[PDB]
Write a protein that binds this ligand. Structure first.
Ligand SMILES: Cc1cc2nc3c(=O)[nH]c(=O)nc-3n(C[C@H](O)[C@H](O)[C@H](O)COP(=O)(O)O)c2cc1C
Length: 177
């Protein structure tokens, strides 16, 4: 299990597609880079994936088991992804659905994010529950029907991909408890 506190942002450097599988090469920050090796199981946008190789600061993962139930299929070279190495709140790295951002509102110190949750998940989500969105675990301010409202501190953008999100952005969600 993981904290759901993002350690740093990686940048997708390469994507190779070969038969309902994709290999993503992701440029890592040095500290996170020094904490991983081939075989490391870590969180990428909140999803458990296994490091299959490393070349320089580029860390590669094969997306195959996760390919139909995560946002990886739709990501592009240059996209930022959240990273967390394994040490509530606590995230397992089993993504429960792909949700879509409904609205992002930027204010002076906050990022107000509204996310349309898959219908199959909404019956077990109340306001004030913790939820993982791309591996950031934070509480829900409100839910009305299938839309959840999370109010993030804007400073979270220096260590995460939250500042890159807009309406229509898909996200990995992990429901807790
Ligand atoms: C130890 C661990 C390592 C995993 N490594 C990968 C992997 O490298 N590639 C992948 O596609 N899925 C991997 N998975 C599976 C994804 O985490 C999983 O498919 C996704 O979170 C949850 O979606 P699912 O239940 O629809 O499969 C791993 C799971 C675990 C527990």
């Amino acid at each position: 299990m993981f904290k759901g506190i993002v350690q740093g942002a990686g940048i997708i450097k390469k994507i190779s597609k070969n038969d309902d599988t994709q290999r993503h090469g992701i440029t890592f920050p040095k500290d996170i880079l020094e904490s991983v090796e081939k075989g490391t199981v870590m969180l990428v946008n909140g999803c458990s994936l296994t490091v299959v190789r490393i070349s320089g600061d580029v860390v590669y993962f094969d997306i195959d088991q996760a390919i139909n139930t995560t946002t990886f299929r739709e990501l592009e070279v240059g996209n930022k992804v959240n990273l967390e190495v394994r040490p509530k709140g606590a995230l397992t790295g089993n993504i429960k659905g792909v949700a879509t951002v409904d609205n992002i509102t930027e204010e002076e110190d906050r990022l107000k994010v509204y996310i349309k949750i898959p219908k199959d998940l909404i019956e077990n989500i109340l306001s004030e529950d913790h939820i993982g969105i791309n591996g950031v675990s934070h509480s829900i301010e409100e839910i009305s029907d299938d839309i959840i409202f999370i109010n993030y501190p804007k400073n979270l953008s220096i260590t995460t991909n939250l500042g890159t999100l807009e309406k229509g952005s898909d996200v990995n969600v992990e429901t807790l408890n």
